[model samples]
Target: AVPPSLRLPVIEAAFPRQLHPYWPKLQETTRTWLLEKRLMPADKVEEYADGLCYTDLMAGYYLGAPDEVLQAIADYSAWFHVWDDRHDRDIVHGRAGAWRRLRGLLHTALDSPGDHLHHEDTLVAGFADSVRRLYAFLPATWNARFARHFHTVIEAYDREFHNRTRGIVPGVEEYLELRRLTFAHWIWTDLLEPSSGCELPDAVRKHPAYRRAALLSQEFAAWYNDLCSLPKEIAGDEVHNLGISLITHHSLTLEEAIGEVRRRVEECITEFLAVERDALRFADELADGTVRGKELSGAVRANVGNMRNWFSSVYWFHHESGRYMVDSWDDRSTPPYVNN
Candidate 1:
């Protein structure tokens, strides 16, 4: 049974929510690709595709993106969940070799882009096919950003796998740093350009203010996801969630820990706005007396709006999806990863 104590209130979003008109159509297409490509099990296609509401997530995150851009993202979103689940399942079953191999194959595929490995896993095949379009549709600069960010995600997962094996629940500070990468929000940020068609200049992305705003924006989603998925993560005896870390390291009761995380989630929105202003000011400063000054500032503003849309839409989508809803808790006598 779901924990009554874990039934936390949905944190209200300050940004407005907007749903794309094509969400339903994209849902069907994403579902078909999952099945046809054998990326998801035939039986669980509906549960993963529709129940999780990932198509709606892509639609919401990339709101107003052209059809081609939307389709690529939708496909990648579908493949992404299955890829994560496979890793989680392998870890639970002590398939460490499989876990490492999957990492290598995905990294190889992501780095090379168009190259195909002989007898490659379906995960790599699906990812290769889905990501190719992203390369085609987006600028080379964006691809560079995507590849680097994705590699970081792989490294983060490596740390997580080792932590799970040793039953290491990270302290809050460490968890926050690792969670941003493992949650894959950097990839989400990378998509902002394609989704909004407003690519920030390399210099703008490198600015201290931009980095602060971007990482904070990522925290907003990561913390929110931890809150929503807490029950499920706890049910699985997972140590990677922020709430769990707080309960362990801070000695807070579960209720208090949940409240603390909820507070952080709300705070992230406020902080994002403040840092967002810093990013804009930097943009303005960069624009001063430059030929592309207006263009640079304008793209920064558009990117900020895109991030706002992302936070707002994802907040609602969490409630819309059944993926984090744990109907039954695992009845294990010992922790799932204790023996590893």
Candidate 2:
């Protein structure tokens, strides 16, 4: 067993529970979306709904987005888990043609808007519709960021598929890059424009420090989650897990890998604080630095709330979700991943 030093940091913060107001609507939305999927059994609506916990998932992200936007986040999160499960299944089974065909349907939704697979696959319909709905709510800069990151992660998932098919375990450094792509939370932060209440100046948004901070934050998300997922993934014989990958690619024992993941978590947080310190100072300079703009300061200050929410939401959501609350690998739910 790993020591307390290696434990995932408990994120305890008060978030005004904004999900209750949206839960019923979200349940209806999720149930209907699942029913439309070609693969799911409509009779299992209650089971899927409980298993997914869509509203709570969005509430966990807690970027202070509006209810409409939160709904979109909930929808997107549900789609990812469901689609990710089914897609990875085919890839793990070595059905490359099946993956290619399904991915073709997915790409069509990106441009054609439910042309070929909308009625045929509810997931595709919801995905295309969500892209339109979610992007319409963001500024074009954030929208472009969202669209770009979506491609980056999906491409990474494709990379993962090929590696899994080839039975290759990536090295530690290689795994970190791939793990960042798989976290998928990077896309959620783009919507912080609404939460922060200021359209960030391009200079602040594009700063190298900002990018560095985001990378650490993304890695924070991935490494922390892998611990929660370790037992669940272990039961399934998944090798992409951080503990598994470290042991396979870096020759670390499971206990050693756990410690290393925790160490990396602390490292990322330390680096994040340094970058955040510089990022804020840079934001101030942008706020007052130029004759070209005067609104930068207000945006910079407003983002403080967004930053707080970003860190605070993690503890509440992950613990609340049944997937991450297991007491031990010795004790687990029947299917392992879904505690509900």
Best by lDDT: 1
TM-score of 1: 0.87
Clashing pairs in 2: none
lDDT of 2: 0.63
lDDT of 1 at 40: 69
lDDT of each: 0.76, 0.63
| Candidate 1 local Cα displacement, residue 306, angstroms | 1.5
TM-scores, each model vs. reference: 0.87, 0.80
TM-score leader: 1
> 42-99 in candidate 2: lDDT tens per residue?
5555554655465665564444466776666676777777676766667656788877
Mind giving the per-residue lDDT tens digits that candidate 1 earns over 150-262? 99998899898889888999999999989988989789878867876656777777788877787777787788789887877877767899999999999999989989998
lDDT value, residue 231 of candidate 1: 72
